[PDB]
Design an enzyme around this catalytic site. Structure first.
Site, PDB file in Angstrom:
ATOM      1  N   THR B   1       0.853  -1.240   0.000  1.00 22.01           N
ATOM      2  CA  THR B   1       0.000   0.000   0.000  1.00 22.01           C
ATOM      3  C   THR B   1       0.891   1.296   0.000  1.00 22.01           C
ATOM      4  O   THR B   1       2.093   1.214  -0.256  1.00 22.01           O
ATOM      5  CB  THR B   1      -0.905  -0.005   1.249  1.00 22.01           C
ATOM      6  OG1 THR B   1      -0.889  -1.297   1.847  1.00 22.01           O
ATOM      7  CG2 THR B   1      -2.326   0.378   0.860  1.00 22.01           C
ATOM      8  N   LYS B  33      -7.617   1.844   4.441  1.00 24.57           N
ATOM      9  CA  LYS B  33      -6.393   1.582   5.182  1.00 24.57           C
ATOM     10  C   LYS B  33      -6.068   2.599   6.289  1.00 24.57           C
ATOM     11  O   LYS B  33      -4.979   2.565   6.874  1.00 24.57           O
ATOM     12  CB  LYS B  33      -5.224   1.498   4.217  1.00 24.57           C
ATOM     13  CG  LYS B  33      -5.549   0.797   2.934  1.00 24.57           C
ATOM     14  CD  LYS B  33      -4.365   0.879   1.985  1.00 24.57           C
ATOM     15  CE  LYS B  33      -4.674   0.121   0.720  1.00 24.57           C
ATOM     16  NZ  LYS B  33      -4.024  -1.203   0.689  1.00 24.57           N
ATOM     17  N   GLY B  45      -3.195   4.391  10.343  1.00 21.59           N
ATOM     18  CA  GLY B  45      -3.155   3.900   8.983  1.00 21.59           C
ATOM     19  C   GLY B  45      -2.174   2.760   8.997  1.00 21.59           C
ATOM     20  O   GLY B  45      -1.110   2.882   9.623  1.00 21.59           O
ATOM     21  N   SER B 125       4.824   0.017   0.414  1.00 23.37           N
ATOM     22  CA  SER B 125       5.697  -0.120  -0.738  1.00 23.37           C
ATOM     23  C   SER B 125       5.810   1.225  -1.422  1.00 23.37           C
ATOM     24  O   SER B 125       6.895   1.599  -1.898  1.00 23.37           O
ATOM     25  CB  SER B 125       5.120  -1.156  -1.692  1.00 23.37           C
ATOM     26  OG  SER B 125       3.699  -1.046  -1.736  1.00 23.37           O
TER      27      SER B 125
END
Ligand SMILES: Nc1ncnc2c1ncn2[C@@H]1O[C@H](COP(=O)(O)OP(=O)(O)OP(=O)(O)O)[C@@H](O)[C@H]1O
Ligand SMILES: Nc1ncnc2c1ncn2[C@@H]1O[C@H](COP(=O)(O)OP(=O)(O)OP(=O)(O)O)[C@@H](O)[C@H]1O
Ligand SMILES: Nc1ncnc2c1ncn2[C@@H]1O[C@H](COP(=O)(O)OP(=O)(O)OP(=O)(O)O)[C@@H](O)[C@H]1O
Lengths: 321, 173, 321, 321, 173
Positions: B1, B33, B45, B125
């Site tokens: 994410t 998220k 988050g 990522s």
């Protein structure tokens, strides 16, 4: 009718060296005892003890201060390790037995004998307890959360009732812990006091800190206190007919020595003096019997000799690469 | 994410995409998220593997519940449950948590990290992309925290094959 | 013949500040006690207590309300931690000792004395329990499913009989828990009340929530209640012959402070006031003795000074990177 | 000389709504009691109780049916949670105390007072037990194999002797469990009854299933039973001098609501009515005191209002991705 | 395997093939990968390794039994037995569960996932195939749920070497 703050501190000064804040604390505590009981009745009951938490290192006076406080107030006393429960009401039960010997033997001084009259003897001890009883919970920092951590955290919950005020039955009747004065001690090296359960952390309002004992402190503990170690040996050898005397440098050397090992190895506070004192009065203590009339003059040279040599550890090697 | 957080002008914003990716395929695109904890007074988050991400989250929550919502103390208390004898179990997930006063990044092996001076945090990522974009904007514009978050998120969804453009942004009055 | 709902709440208002919903709850409870016992006989037995579950943070009055409720109803009372069982019938057994003592109190007061009559008294005491006994199960949220989770979940199953009504034997005879009024309290930070076992969740019909105490609330707790902290010190210092007085801004300042630490650190409710109050009455408490005749005027400046400085934590550094 | 099957079911219909198969079952059971004891002597002993296993969800009458069966048969009764043993003979020991009180009650119901003679009074209760005693083992499905699964599987083996008929000593003498009628209940959501140990699965011949209670069933339970919830409040408010009345639509609404939450959340059977009833009689219950003479007409609008709003869960979010 | 579910017009259908494959060989072709739970009021289809797939199913069932068959709550309750201190044990298997009200996808490491707007779910090596075919039909025809399921399943059995054409389809009145 009863001692006062400054009055009590003075009495404690006769047995404990240093630890003022501590002395003061327990003083104003024993005093609030006389302050209440002077109050009418609604408030008389409403006002409760302001329990104490003594925080200091090993053997620096935490216990003697409390033991003497009770002694000079002629109050039922009892000391218990907190970990001892890892039956809690036994603490009160035991405190009450102490009040029988204290009341019994003490009223025997009033008067082959007999007025005696037990249903009143009991009713009177039970008062001494409910009125001026004193419980000393030792090493309470050992039951702080830090695992079977609940086994200990449980002990805290188990002490609440007594501290928070409740009732427990003794072989002499029912007693209330509502006005028992509690004193908990702890070193708190790893745990902080704020690690106790809130319910309890709030019932221990007064936090007072005790200082570590220094070479200089030992020097005084060695001679000043009523029935200090030196005063005691002098007295004992006296019986074998030997007259002993400690030069100042001797005392200074004995203390420098106690402190020295306390630092180099496991620090066990003032207890360490009984250790070194016994290692020194060693030889004399034996021969004293058939040494009548003589007089030993213990100076620095003597002590240095009698103590031999004491270790500055080799954790070294063995475990180090 | 890609989860990023910017704090500027008494405002704290935490935003992230919504791409749940299983392997090189995409399972869900509208995932949330970023969520609110402790009576909506704190933002969270999470990046990392789904489940772990969730347990790591649910854990911090219990902590927040036990400590009057003190973000900083709760983080540390939770970290300390890994930093001991009896391990807790390594979780492959990170969280970015923030309340009115602090912004923090917590991981699943126990270790709380504070932001650098700029008060910008990003994980996932696509983290550094959002992070680079965000630093650029915070240092060269008067854009609000919210805008910078929104902006960086996209710039990153455009570079990361695991981050999409369906965002979920939360700010703290 | 007995107080009324509004009547009882008024009595409680004399000791507890705020927490209305709570007061109301226990009031209508102690009232349903007089309502039944007025009924014929079939329904007299059929109607049972509507037990209460108080839900609120630490030390906000949950216990005082119950202890006082019992006090003003002159009813046998007993408090127990739920975790204390992680012998449950002891709860009733203990509640009965409390009663025997509570009834025996009426005899040796309504008659070098003798009426005793074992068979007589015991019956009457046992009735006091079965009729208006009150049990207070503390921190019941601690035995909720949330591991050895069955050890606690078990405690719930063990309480059922009492709550659900059954019989247990005491050293005074057999008593029935069918009409004992139970009051369980909990903080329920992690667990919800619906996490209790149904059998029990349904025997606790009345759910009432208590509020966290605010600076403003403390301000009132500090002075309003019968025998508030300020009323107490005033009374205590009076004995040493010192006349003390708290300016309004002082009280405001003391509470602003208690509340302040409660927020910044571990919030322990009202207890915090005994903490700050003892830290302030500190100096006076000792010197009060040889300070006769004087009069201390405790204003804001005094308090601000006597309290020193209290910490806004450094979890900071140390554990953070 | 004793009630009959249809006779007994009619008596039970006065307290329990629905659950016919169940009623019938315990009926023929209490009847087989009169049937034997009419037999000669060889068979009199040979014929044993045909124990019952009740299978139904939470709070649908399982216990009331048994408690009432015993009541109308004036038989020593006792309820125990099966998990309570995860001393079993206590079950019989307790059942006997119950009968001893239920029999002291008679030799006293007849015309100081020495129509006693313990020796023969004991033999009298002891028979009551051996003859018509009733044991009710609750949530037996909790001790079925499903780990420490042997700790519970063990409890089954421990109950055998009593069920299989044996002897246990009580402070009143020796009693035989050979003719004690056992009724075990369980929900059996995960475990099947065939998961009990065979030795026991065969000592529980009669299996009878109870139904879940419906809105329509609640409606009736709310008003029909002797001393229903509505009949109870009416009675209670009467004492404060308030006259209350429930409109049909009210009652319908109350039930529709209990049932509604039971479905949307944790279904706790009929207990749910005490819950909703207490939440509604809320306001009145308090004000009733100073509301003398008035008369409250509780209709649908009142109910709809007093119940406020009750939740259709947000398991949503938080845990779902 | 290929397990897919489409929900359209108050209809919920879950279907899957029947190819149990051991290595690159095929052991059984008539396997029933979709079954009914809680008094046939809820459908469950499972992909992943056989045993785990079964334990993951039998687990969800005991949960369903303890919660009056509330599909959503049971799922969460079960997920929560992985998202804690004391792990449950990672299971290599996924389930697609559905009842009159909801459609959910549950995995063996505990995490419940909801479908995207279209209400279509699919799992298994040939999942995306069925998913693609299903999304196409739902967005471009008036075909019933059942038909689309049947249709997508085949389109997938034709691409995946692990999915055959022997289907087992269950719908929820
Ligand atoms: N400050 C002191 N003044 C005089 N004697 C002291 C002092 N400190 C310790 N002692 C003596 O040394 C011993 C100290 O033991 P004590 O139990 O009083 O200490 P403590 O601090 O309570 O230790 P613990 O960790 O066991 O509580 C006693 O025999 C006491 O007489
Ligand atoms: N609202 C209040 N009014 C007056 N005094 C209060 C109030 N709340 C608390 N106190 C005082 O503070 C203390 C609170 O302790 P109490 O046990 O009553 O609180 P609690 O909330 O029931 O705690 P626990 O967590 O032990 O249930 C008591 O000494 C009481 O005198
Ligand atoms: N069918 C019914 N008719 C009338 N009253 C009922 C009925 N079912 C329950 N009640 C009332 O609701 C309560 C139900 O409790 P009961 O002990 O009978 O439940 P149970 O089915 O035995 O549950 P468990 O055995 O799981 O505790 C009792 O107070 C009973 O009076």
């Amino acid at each position: 009718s009863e001692m006062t703050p400054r009055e009590i501190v003075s009495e404690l000064d006769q047995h404990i060296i240093g630890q003022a804040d501590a002395k003061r604390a327990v003083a104003i505590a024993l005093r609030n005892r006389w302050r209440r009981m002077q109050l009418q009745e609604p408030l008389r009951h409403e006002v409760t003890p302001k329990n104490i938490l003594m925080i200091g290192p090993t053997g620096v006076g935490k216990t003697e201060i409390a033991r003497r406080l009770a002694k000079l107030a002629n109050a039922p006393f009892i000391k218990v390790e907190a970990t001892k429960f890892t039956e809690v009401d036994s603490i009160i039960r035991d405190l009450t037995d102490s009040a029988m010997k204290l009341v019994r033997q003490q009223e025997i001084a009033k008067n082959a004998a007999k007025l005696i009259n037990p249903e009143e003897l009991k009713q009177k001890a039970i008062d001494a307890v409910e009125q001026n009883g004193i419980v000393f919970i030792d090493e309470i920092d050992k039951i702080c959360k830090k695992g079977a951590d609940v086994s200990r955290e449980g002990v805290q919950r188990d002490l609440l009732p007594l501290v928070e005020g409740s009732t427990v039955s003794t072989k002499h009747g029912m007693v209330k812990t509502d006005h028992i004065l509690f004193i908990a001690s702890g070193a708190f090296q790893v745990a902080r006091p704020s690690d106790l359960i809130p319910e309890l952390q709030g019932r221990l309002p007064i936090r007072v800190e005790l200082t570590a004992l220094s070479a200089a402190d030992f020097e005084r503990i060695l001679t000043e206190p009523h029935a200090s170690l030196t005063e005691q040996y002098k007295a004992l050898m006296a019986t074998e007919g030997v007259n002993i005397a400690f030069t100042t440098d001797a005392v200074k050397k004995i203390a420098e020595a106690a402190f020295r090992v306390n630092e180099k190895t496991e620090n066990i506070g003032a207890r360490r003096l009984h250790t070194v004192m016994e290692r020194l009065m060693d030889k004399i203590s034996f021969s004293a019997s058939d040494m009548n009339g003589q007089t030993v003059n213990i100076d620095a040279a003597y002590v240095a000799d009698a103590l031999g040599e004491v270790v500055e550890n080799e954790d070294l090697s063995r475990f180090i690469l | 994410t890609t989860i990023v957080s910017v704090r500027r002008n008494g405002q704290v914003v935490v935003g992230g995409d919504g791409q749940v990716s299983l392997g090189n395929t995409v399972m869900k695109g509208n995932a949330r998220k970023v969520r609110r904890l402790y009576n909506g007074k704190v933002l969270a988050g999470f990046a990392g593997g789904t489940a772990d991400a969730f347990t790591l989250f649910e854990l911090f929550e219990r902590k927040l519940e036990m400590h009057q919502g003190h973000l900083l103390k709760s983080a540390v208390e939770l970290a300390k449950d890994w930093r001991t004898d009896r391990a807790l179990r390594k979780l492959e997930a990170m969280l970015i948590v923030a309340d009115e006063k602090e912004s923090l990044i917590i991981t699943g092996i126990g270790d709380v990290v504070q932001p650098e001076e700029d008060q910008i945090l990003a994980i996932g990522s696509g983290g550094n992309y959002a992070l680079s974009a965000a630093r650029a904007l915070v240092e060269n514009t008067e854009l609000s925290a919210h805008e910078i978050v929104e902006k960086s998120l996209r710039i990153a969804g455009d570079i990361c094959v695991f981050t999409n453009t369906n965002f979920t942004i939360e700010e703290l009055p």
